[PDB]
Design a protein around this ligand. Structure first.
Ligand SMILES: c1cn2cnc3[nH]cnc3c2n1
Length: 215
């Protein structure tokens, strides 16, 4: 049992029929990074509300470079109010503002950030965990990184393989793909990237998990 076998089996379930191409809505945009941070320790449904708040308040509009600067310079207590629904809202506002200000400071623009960010840089941002860091890397920056989480741990454990450590679990999941790269890609069309494959693969596990299915 490896992650390629799991991908094929999950894929044949058609779990993403209703999803966008990268699973995460508004993938590859600033909003994906905001979601990746806001989703920590909460339900994604709640994250969607925070983003709705941000949009309804015209804090987030159509230009991501403007959006980045808006979040970096927004009054703490206003942002904190906005992201109430996803909980831990004072911590997350501070986290987002510091992150956004540090992106500007180190990378000048969100565009350049998407190109130059590393996991270690993200991990040096106070409050950003591996999962969030990785979700930013994959779902906001199109990097070849597969997010893992509690879902993936529990999903694998049920299939008979237990990997508690975040990095080893992720390596287990990435390596089965890497090892069968051409055959994994061939499941699609040779249309999509490996980053998108990971984006979708993690999506499948999440969806599989919410739907309460058996492999
Ligand atoms: C449905 C779509 N989703 C996108 N991104 C997420 N991050 C965590 N859960 C989700 C999710 N559920």
């Amino acid at each position: 049992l490896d992650s390629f076998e799991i991908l094929k089996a999950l894929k044949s379930l058609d779990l993403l029929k209703n999803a966008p191409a990268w699973w995460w809505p508004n993938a590859l945009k600033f909003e994906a990074l905001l979601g990746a941070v806001l989703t920590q320790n909460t339900k994604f449904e709640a994250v969607l509300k925070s983003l709705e708040n941000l949009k309804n308040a015209f804090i987030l509009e159509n230009d991501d470079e403007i959006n980045l600067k808006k979040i970096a310079y927004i009054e703490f207590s206003k942002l904190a109010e906005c992201v109430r629904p996803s909980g831990f809202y004072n911590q997350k506002a501070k986290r987002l503002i510091d992150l956004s200000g540090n992106i500007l400071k180190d990378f000048q623009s969100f565009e350049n950030f998407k190109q130059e960010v590393t996991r270690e840089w993200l991990l040096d941002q106070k409050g950003i965990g591996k999962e969030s860091a990785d979700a930013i890397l994959c779902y906001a920056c199109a990097k070849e990184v597969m997010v893992v989480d509690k879902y993936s741990y529990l999903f694998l454990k049920k299939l008979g393989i237990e990997i508690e450590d975040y990095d080893e679990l992720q390596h287990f999941f990435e390596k089965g793909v890497q090892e069968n790269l051409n055959s994994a890609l061939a499941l699609y069309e040779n249309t999509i990237s490996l980053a998108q494959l990971y984006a979708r693969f993690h999506g499948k596990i999440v969806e599989f998990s919410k739907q309460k299915l058996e492999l």
